Design a protein around this ligand. Sequence first.
Ligand SMILES: O=C(O)CCC(=O)C(=O)O
Ligand SMILES: [Fe+3]
Lengths: 20, 220
Amino acid sequence: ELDLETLAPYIPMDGEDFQL
Amino acid sequence: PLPALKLALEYIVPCMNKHGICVVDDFLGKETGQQIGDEVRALHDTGKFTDGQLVSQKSDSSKDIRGDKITWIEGKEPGCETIGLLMSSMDDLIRHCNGKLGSYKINGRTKAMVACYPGNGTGYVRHVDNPNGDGRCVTCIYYLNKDWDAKVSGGILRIFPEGKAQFADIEPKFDRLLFFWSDRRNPHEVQPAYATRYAITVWYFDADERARAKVKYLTG
Ligand SMILES: O=C(O)CCC(=O)C(=O)O
Ligand SMILES: [Fe+3]
């Protein structure tokens, strides 16, 4: 099987993230 | 935009729980949609876009996977005020969905990905947005292509919702808002685009999954 993370759109894992 | 409470509880929530995909057409109206288009075109014209990237990078060029160019927008930047209004309207809908979208607890989101497929047959191969638990639970996309004729310019987002007898073809229509579960239930592809195609995505996080993903990242 294929590692699907190699096709997945990047998002920052560092920093915060925006809080709702 | 329409009153968030009713749109969220009476349309978005049931549509998402039954189908995992929800289309809201004519979300913000023509005037606001055109203002967003002008802000996006200004980002494009001033060289802000860079090659779209992938979660994990192996030997392959990113352009063999996704052919778009993007920039990340927080919402308060000068010249992005209407994009900021879009993001706040998305957020308002999600907040009115609190605790009603599956079992998720949505507490946060990414910045907005402003993305352009610059024609020339560019697209995005079939993929899952969040295949291995990075916290993303809802993908939210706003399309802003006035005059798009998909039969000639392509660029259809085709989603293959798991277990369904038909796939879901989403034309990147002006002022269309789209939600879908980001996990493996919704593999999808952007079919080749033959004109300049714009869309703005935010991903909403499930609190517990996102915490687990952050722990994994912070521990190596
Ligand atoms: O623009 C679209 O319709 C979808 C883009 C997409 O699938 C992505 O960037 O992950
Ligand atoms: Fe995607």
